Design a protein around this ligand. Structure first.
Ligand SMILES: CCCCCCCCCCCCCCCCCC(=O)O
Ligand SMILES: CCCCCCCCCCCCCCCCCC(=O)O
Lengths: 131, 131
């Protein structure tokens, strides 16, 4: 996933508050989240890929091997089981918790990194450019 | 309620999608609603006050006597019991349905009409100016 390595800064977001509503995130956290303009830092070391999101409010960090299910605690504090695979040049993440699931796809589009989040038919698109 | 009579056009809205989420309005109706820039027409005839909201998508109209509870079917199709009183120069509306309630206050502020909608601690403010 060499095309993903770097530091990325958020440029635009579409429907992210609707996505968070569908995921069940509360009002106060949804308002903090929409004020954040996180930076995403992706790095690879051997077999382990690390994705870090940094903001004034909350930093998150996950390190994983592609194809191996792992425990993740999301920024909104859900404890989920995640698995990320490399498919068609995109990182596809599925998170499962309480009988629910959501898909987060990170893909390159031109010189940008695009994050698509889908929860029960609601789709959010967030576009990042290199910092 | 002479200070309210006229045709008013929406100028700004704050937190209305969050208010609709709290009321339980579905995704598609919330998206149509946020695209509408309704005109509000208020008129008085004898004892009956009429408030009409017009948009490309949905027109609603309620006629009522201040202080008398009546049946209303909202734009998002809830069948509610409403009562509107005149208090401190503002029209205060309470809608009750399924053991829930929400308050909609319509008040004058300078040359504007302000609508405040409150559902369980989430507040939306919509400002109208004369058309
Ligand atoms: C006080 C906490 C402040 C930060 C809150 C962030 C809350 C985000 C809740 C929903 C997380 C959804 C999963 C991440 C979706 C992709 C986000 C991204 O990388 O742009
Ligand atoms: C297809 C329907 C298109 C129009 C949808 C409008 C849906 C609005 C749903 C919520 C109604 C809340 C009550 C009205 C709140 C005050 C609105 C206002 O006068 O600005």
């Amino acid at each position: 996933c060499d095309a993903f390595v770097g530091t990325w800064k958020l440029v635009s977001s579409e429907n992210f508050d609707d996505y968070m509503k569908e995921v069940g995130v509360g009002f106060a956290t949804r308002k903090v989240a929409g004020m954040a303009k996180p930076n995403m830092i992706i790095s690879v070391n051997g077999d382990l890929v690390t994705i870090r999101s940094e903001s004034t409010f909350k930093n998150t960090e996950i390190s994983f091997k592609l194809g191996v299910e792992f425990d993740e605690i999301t920024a909104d504090d859900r404890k989920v089981k995640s698995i990320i695979t490399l498919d068609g040049g995109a990182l596809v993440q599925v998170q499962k918790w309480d009988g629910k699931s959501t898909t987060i796809k990170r893909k390159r589009d031109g010189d940008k990194l695009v994050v698509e989040c889908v929860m029960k038919g609601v789709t959010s698109t967030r576009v990042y450019e290199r910092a």
